[PDB]
Design a protein around this ligand. Sequence first.
Ligand code: FDE
Length: 184
Amino acid sequence: ACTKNAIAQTGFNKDKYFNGDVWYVTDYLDLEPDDVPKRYCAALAAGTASGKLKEALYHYDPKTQDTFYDVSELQVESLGKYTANFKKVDKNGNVKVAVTAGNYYTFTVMYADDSSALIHTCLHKGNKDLGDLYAVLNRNKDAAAGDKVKSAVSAATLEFSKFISTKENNCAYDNDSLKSLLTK
Ligand code: FDE
């Protein structure tokens, strides 16, 4: 179940966030913690491709090796808050599972600057969801969370100390496939 109406950053700069580059998840918190493994790797590219707002996603479970990519088309609900379809694709953009009405996530950018961000998502796959999931992002896959984003976690009435880090999982990312997937 999702329970939070996440508030988007005041004065969110959409063109900077959606610049075509990659964001790495460095830390995450699910309010239903059993919905996601204790060890995980994830990243995303976000950009406009031929006028369309897009996100490409990568998930990797470093223990099981479960791997998947997704291409997402975002619709705007308000500045910094989106609803996103998703099609599961291979790294080259070939469709494995097509878009369908029932498969979507909400996505809210709660804080962003040029190098870090805090987002919330609520994933739906039919009648199931993956709970409220918060993620701290960085442009540098190895960056420890700095004061701006940690303060934003506190401003959302969360505690950064409770977030689970991805840094000890030997995560390795295909940045090229995330960037190319934006077009697919
Ligand atoms: C730790 C983590 C982190 C993250 C992040 C993220 C972001 C930022 C966004 C997202 C989204 C998503 N996811 Fe996410 N994520 C996670 C997790 C996860 C998991 C475990 C999964 C699976 C579920 C199932 O159902 O199986 C996912 C999942 C997911 C999805 C689905 C895909 C397919 O195709 O199926 C999506 C769309 N994710 N995501």
